[PDB]
Design a protein around this nucleic acid. Structure first.
Ligand SMILES: Nc1ncnc2c1ncn2[C@@H]1O[C@H](COP(=O)(O)O)[C@@H](O)[C@H]1O
Ligand SMILES: [Mg+2]
Ligand SMILES: [Mg+2]
Ligand SMILES: [Mg+2]
Ligand SMILES: [Mg+2]
Ligand SMILES: [Mg+2]
Lengths: 278, 169, 97, 120, 184, 196, 104
RNA sequence: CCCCAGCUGCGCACACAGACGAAGGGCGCGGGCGCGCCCGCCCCGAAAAUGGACGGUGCUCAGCGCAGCCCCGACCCCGCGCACGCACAGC
RNA sequence: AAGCGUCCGCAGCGACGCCGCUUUUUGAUUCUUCGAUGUCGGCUCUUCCUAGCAUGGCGUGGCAGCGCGCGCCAAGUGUUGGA
RNA sequence: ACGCCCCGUGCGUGUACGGCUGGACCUCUAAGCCGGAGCCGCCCCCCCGUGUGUCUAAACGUUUCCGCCCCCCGC
């Protein structure tokens, strides 16, 4: 029969199944819409979370002083070392041509090894006579992305020399000029100030803090059962009706909480600065 | 189907040596339905039931289709629906009388779901073009009528063929 | 666009029976039509069962069977003859080299 | 159709006892010796040669080709009357223009379109 | 009733050429040239003897009704591509003066202060249609080369600028059709 | 026997094409269906959309990960049609389904191939022109298949290359015909038959 | 010797069956090019062979086209050994000579 | 088509219809009778709870009707052989 | 559709009657279960239906506005704290 | 968490419905067309598993680094 008092569902079904993320680095699943009248620019960057503080800012409406929590994302410049071109196929997007630089350093080829200290470092032994043929087929692409890696050794607090590699879409005009910019930027660093600016909204993609196997009260916020409850209070009591004779996937069960991929929209950049300058 | 003229009478006895001879013109599938449609009319017009009927003659009325033109036929019929019994008058153009009633049966079945046994024909008269009452059959009585074929029809039995092959023409 | 009219030549719609000529002698309705064979026999057929040829023959509504059959235009293989046929193309492809 | 030779145009001579048939596609022309097979395995074609000679030959030693076995028989023999009646159908094949190529060529199936096309 | 043949022809006047291939029609008139697709009709379209002929064989009353609309849509496309249509619209208001104004060279009409509303109702013009103010004030006229794009462009304004959610008997303000006629 | 058929899907009624496809598949034919975005569903489009929304509504409430899967491509939706015209749970029907490959448009693997049609399943043969109809790509482009325009553009570039090669090939059929009719060729031919 | 040189290939499409009950002694064949019942009358009584391999060794299972089947030129054949349902969809070769019901 | 076996013709219907239904209705279409009736098809009336059932696929000539010729299909019937029973040229 | 509704059968109602639907009531029955299917309510938690309460779009009024009534489409999101 | 931040807009089919043109004298309808719902579908977001692209490797089944991975060790 009908439940006596109605209430919203505990937790979103949009994020169920709550599984662990497949990686710690998340690739951009969707870049912004490429506008040919826009100038050539990159669309993403890869930063590292340093910590939080709060700023005080004047909120003009009369002026009222407000304080707001901010968070500081350390962004060493990313080195562009490859180009990936895509074509619009009736099955979707397809790799048209991958063009790498002749130089791949010890940081970014640490990523290609599981145990690097025991390795022989022979990845990417790799001709420059085929560049113009590879640039020409790359000009036939529909979507141009650069292969950029992070410079994780520049942080030095993270005991990680192994770099994070990702594709960043080159948005601008006339795919000819996209790869002419991209071959210019091979083995060059891209600053965070070149990609973003202050008071603009960005989307952050990352993996949450892992909480391990958690019960339903933390995982979903279901009500703790009363004090008299035999066999446990931090539960959902009825996990399903008699029919259907299975448990639905919509019922909150105990499992993995945290270490999920999350994309948060419209995070405003308050300040872009350098950690050395005051 | 076929047309039958079935002659019959009461079986002659010592009391009635020459009974009155009757005949019925039936459009039937065969002679056994034609005997059956004759026996009901002797049972219901007169009171002669089928045990006391002798069927004197059954002949197939067949037309000579020597030069085979199309005649017009006006058919007065009585058909029984699920709801009642009604009179209808239908006009057809056909080859023979026995083909025109086949056009009657396929039309009453298509338009009214009247089965062949649910239909009794009052009269079938071959008509002039001037005496036709249906304007649809009048259109084809005009000389020099012409129309094209717009339905596609295949020129063989095919399961799969290449694209270039003509199949309709 | 070939029309169904009296005097329009026709053949059976099947390709294996295209050797037979018909001529439309009378029109019943949208769908049925009397055709006359070159052998003089007439039969009522469907319009869908015919493939209309391009030619129309000078026939009017009430003509005799002999009168229409005057105006209809006039219309096997062995293994050895098939061999002689296939050998002809056998050499014909060799000359083109 | 089913013999040692099994796609070879030959000519038919005589029907023999126990359901057999004497045949010789002439050994100069198509390299086929005298043989007897079953009567049914001969697919009949419409063309007949004009052979007037008597075909009552000394069949006692002729190589009989069975159905499935492709057993390699011994080569050609003395051929007392076989040489004469072979030359009579080489005489018959010379009168007709392309018939020499016909008996030499192995049989190919006609491209099927109907069973009327399978008349032979 | 299934007549054996229903036929009507549309007399192509002098100065325009009509070309019909596989039930699409290209008219080349003085005012504009429009290419019209009539393949939703099941008809034989041919232009012969200077009048486009539509013929229907053994057609039902449903089909020959569609014969006539194909004839009237060809009549309208011809004199739209020859003369051109224009629709006249009267702006009616009791209390608040509506101000209609054209932008984008007559490709859009703004309507402001409709019933004292702040929201500016813009209405775009479906292709090859031009709006301008009426020579009489409190009127604007939309004019173009096809009756459907003219009467829909005017028709959206007559549909959207009525008064809804307040009583339409007491509130009579809105834009209405006055007169519908061809150019000249 | 050449038991490999390449079907062009334009102008075909879907379930009527699928019966002749599945009956061939169970007899050992390997069928490939091209241009599956143009396979036709008869009737007006709104009835066909309600049939699709009825399909989308059916899912496992307990676990839709194992529910009735809903296909937005015309190729996988047409594959789903022929899937149940064979006995696919048995090994004879699943083996037959491995001989289907259904594609939208013409991929360049199928450039210059020889495409077939099922004329008993054609829309111009079966349907009345009074009746409405709609293709798969007309339906499914409003149900999440985003690739209608890129299919038709790449379809056109294949058909223009094939029309180009047909313009070259039939000219070679023209000149070979004009050569084989020439009296120089004939007396060359009767000279060889003289020597045989 | 190729089978397609002298014999017409026919695809083994089904056994003779009901909707459910299957009688495997009679195999239904579809001869190529044969599309009508009167066309298949040319092949009544004709021998038929199904060629297969057992441990790489070639075998001939011989049969006779026994009766017609349907209106579409499908014929029913009875072989020495019944055809397995594995071979449904594969080809068997129809001979051009008649054989008898006793003697294949 | 699953699934053995279909073709030739003539009609009719468009409603996610055929594929549960009433009273009462429908300038919906097709026939018929004297604007009103009648007959077919369709429509409205016609709303249930896991997602889902003309059996499914699907079908708009795979629906609703008819005709012609054909085909498939039981251990039935027929014929033959064998087993067993009988009072046994057989049943 | 008798009547009511200022006049006005149908804006909205609607008697006297009649036709249905539903299985959310209770019976009727006794088909399943008596070598047992744990019997009310609540708490908890999920889902579904629409005969739609709110929220979205509308049509209608005996709708001036404000409001209220009647009807339509739509089951997305909601539908509380207490004696 | 009792604290703080983000959940923003869009696009499309098209419901009811309003319209346009327009037939069988009007007519939103029979053909066609326009607009149109918190619905529906995309987009976004999350998950899945299959693919795509790139990189890389010696000897004579054994030697063994020839390419590596895994355990072990630490965090
Ligand atoms: N009953 C009909 N009367 C007139 N034209 C028709 C009819 N049926 C089809 N058509 C037209 O015939 C053409 C298609 O015929 P087809 O030559 O078969 O492609 C199209 O222009 C149709 O509109
Ligand atoms: Mg307790
Ligand atoms: Mg079958
Ligand atoms: Mg018995
Ligand atoms: Mg128990
Ligand atoms: Mg229990």
């Amino acid at each position: 029969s009908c439940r006596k008092f109605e209430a919203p569902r505990h937790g979103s079904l949009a994020y169920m199944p709550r599984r662990r993320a497949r990686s710690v680095k998340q690739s951009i699943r969707a870049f912004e819409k490429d506008n040919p009248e826009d100038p050539i620019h990159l669309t993403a960057f890869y930063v590292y979370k340093a910590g939080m503080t709060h700023v005080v800012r004047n909120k003009a409406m009369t002026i009222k002083e407000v304080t707001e929590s901010v968070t500081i994302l350390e962004a060493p410049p990313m080195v562009v070392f490859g180009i990936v071109g895509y074509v619009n196929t009736p099955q979707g997007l397809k790799i048209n041509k991958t063009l790498l630089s002749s130089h791949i350093n010890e940081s970014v080829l640490r990523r290609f090894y599981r145990k690097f200290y025991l390795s022989k470092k022979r990845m990417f032994s790799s001709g420059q006579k085929e560049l113009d043929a590879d640039i020409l087929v790359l000009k036939d692409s529909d979507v141009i992305r650069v292969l950029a890696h992070t410079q994780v050794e520049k942080i030095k607090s993270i005991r990680t020399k192994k770099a994070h590699i990702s594709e960043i879409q080159v948005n601008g005009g006339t795919v000819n000029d996209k790869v002419e910019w991209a071959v210019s930027m091979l083995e060059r660093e891209v600053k965070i100030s070149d990609v973003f600016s202050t008071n603009e909204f960005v989307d952050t993609i990352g993996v949450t803090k892992g909480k391990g196997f958690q019960g339903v009260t933390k995982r979903f916020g279901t009500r703790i059962l009363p004090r008299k409850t035999n066999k446990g209070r931090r539960k959902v009591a009825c996990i399903g009706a008699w029919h259907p004779a299975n448990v639905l996937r919509t019922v909150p069960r105990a499992g993995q909480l945290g270490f999920h991929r999350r994309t948060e929209l419209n995070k405003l950049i308050y300040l872009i600065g350098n950690g050395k300058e005051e | 189907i076929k047309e039958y003229r079935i002659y019959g009478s009461k079986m002659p006895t010592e009391q009635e040596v020459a009974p009155q001879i009757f005949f019925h013109n039936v459009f039937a599938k065969n002679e056994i339905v034609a005997r059956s449609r004759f026996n009901n009319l002797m049972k219901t017009k007169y009171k002669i039931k089928s045990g006391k009927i002798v069927i004197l003659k059954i002949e197939e009325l067949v037309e000579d289709l020597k030069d085979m033109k199309i005649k017009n036929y006006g058919i007065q019929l009585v058909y029984r629906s699920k709801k009642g019994i009604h009179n209808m008058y239908k006009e057809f153009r056909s080859i023979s009388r026995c083909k025109a009633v086949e056009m009657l049966f396929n039309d009453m079945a298509g338009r009214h779901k009247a089965k062949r046994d649910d239909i009794k024909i009052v009269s079938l008269k071959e008509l002039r073009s001037e005496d036709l009452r249906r304007d649809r059959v009048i259109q084809f009585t005009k000389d020099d009528v012409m129309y094209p074929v717009f339905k596609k029809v295949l020129n063989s039995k095919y399961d799969f063929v290449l694209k270039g092959t003509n199949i309709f023409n | 666009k070939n029309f169904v009219q009296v005097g329009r030549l026709a053949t059976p719609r099947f390709l294996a029976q295209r050797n037979i000529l018909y001529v439309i002698t009378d029109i019943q309705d949208d769908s049925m039509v009397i055709v006359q064979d070159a052998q003089g026999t007439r039969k009522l057929v469907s319009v869908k069962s015919l493939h209309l040829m391009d030619d129309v023959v000078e026939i009017h509504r009430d003509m005799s069977v002999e009168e229409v059959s005057k105006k209809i235009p006039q219309q096997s293989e062995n293994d050895f003859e098939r061999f002689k046929r296939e050998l002809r193309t056998e050499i014909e492809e060799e000359v083109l080299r | 159709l089913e013999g040692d030779f099994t796609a070879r145009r030959v000519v038919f001579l005589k029907q023999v006892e126990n359901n057999k048939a004497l045949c010789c596609g002439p050994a100069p022309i198509n390299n086929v010796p005298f043989f007897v097979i079953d009567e049914r395995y001969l697919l009949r074609t419409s063309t007949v040669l004009d052979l007037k000679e008597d075909v009552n030959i000394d069949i006692s030693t002729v190589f009989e080709s069975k159905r499935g076995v492709v057993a390699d028989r011994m080569d050609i023999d003395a051929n007392s009357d076989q040489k004469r009646i072979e030359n009579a159908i080489v005489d018959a094949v010379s009168s007709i223009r392309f018939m020499k190529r016909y008996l030499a060529t192995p049989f190919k199936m006609p491209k099927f379109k109907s069973v009327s096309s399978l008349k032979f | 009733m299934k007549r054996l043949l229903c036929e009507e022809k549309v007399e192509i006047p002098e100065g325009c050429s009509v070309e019909i291939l596989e039930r699409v029609m290209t008219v080349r008139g003085k005012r504009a040239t429009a290419v019209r697709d009539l393949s939703h009709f099941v008809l034989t379209m041919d232009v012969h003897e200077g009048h486009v002929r539509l013929r229907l064989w053994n057609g039902t009353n449903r089909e020959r009704s569609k014969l006539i609309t194909c004839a009237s849509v060809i009549r309208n496309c011809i004199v739209g591509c020859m003369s051109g249509y224009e629709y006249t619209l009267k702006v009616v208001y009791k209390h608040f003066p509506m101000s209609v104004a054209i932008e984008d060279d007559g490709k859009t009409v703004v309507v402001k202060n409709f019933l004292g509303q702040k929201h500016a109702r813009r209405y775009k013009m479906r292709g090859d249609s031009i709006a301008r103010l009426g020579t009489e004030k409190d009127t604007f006229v939309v004019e173009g080369s096809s009756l459907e794009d003219v009467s829909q462009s005017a028709g959206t304004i007559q549909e959207n600028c009525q008064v809804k959610k307040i009583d339409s008997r007491t509130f009579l303000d809105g834009i209405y059709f006055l007169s519908r006629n061809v150019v000249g | 026997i050449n038991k490999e058929i390449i079907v062009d899907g334009t102008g075909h009624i879907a379930g009527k094409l699928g019966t002749y496809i599945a009956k061939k598949l169970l007899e050992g034919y390997t069928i490939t269906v091209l241009c599956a975005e143009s396979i036709v569903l008869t009737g007006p489009i709104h009835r066909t959309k309600l049939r699709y929304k009825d399909y989308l509504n059916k899912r496992c409430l307990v676990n839709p990960l194992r529910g009735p899967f809903h296909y937005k491509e015309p190729s996988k939706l047409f594959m789903r049609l022929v899937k149940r015209m064979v006995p696919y749970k048995k090994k004879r029907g699943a083996a037959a389904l491995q001989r289907l490959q259904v594609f939208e448009g013409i991929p360049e693997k199928f450039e210059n191939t020889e495409r077939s049609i099922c004329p008993r399943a054609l829309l111009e043969y079966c349907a009345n022109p009074i009746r409405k109809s709609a293709t798969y790509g007309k339906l499914l482009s409003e149900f999440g298949w985003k690739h209608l325009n890129i299919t038709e553009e790449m379809k056109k570039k294949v058909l223009q290359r094939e029309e180009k090669a047909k313009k070259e090939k039939d000219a070679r059929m023209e000149e070979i015909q004009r050569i084989r009719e020439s009296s120089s060729f004939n007396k060359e031919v009767e000279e060889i038959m003289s020597r045989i | 010797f190729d089978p397609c040189l002298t014999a017409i290939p026919a695809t083994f499409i089904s056994h003779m069956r009901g909707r459910r009950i299957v009688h495997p002694s009679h195999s239904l064949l579809r001869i190529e090019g044969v599309k009508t019942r009167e066309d298949a009358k040319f092949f009544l009584g004709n021998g038929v062979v199904s060629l297969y391999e057992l441990s790489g060794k070639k075998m001939e299972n011989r049969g006779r086209i026994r009766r017609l089947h349907g209106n579409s030129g499908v014929v029913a054949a009875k072989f020495e050994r019944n055809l397995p349902p594995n071979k449904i969809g594969t080809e068997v070769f129809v001979k051009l000579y008649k054989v008898e019901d006793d003697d294949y």
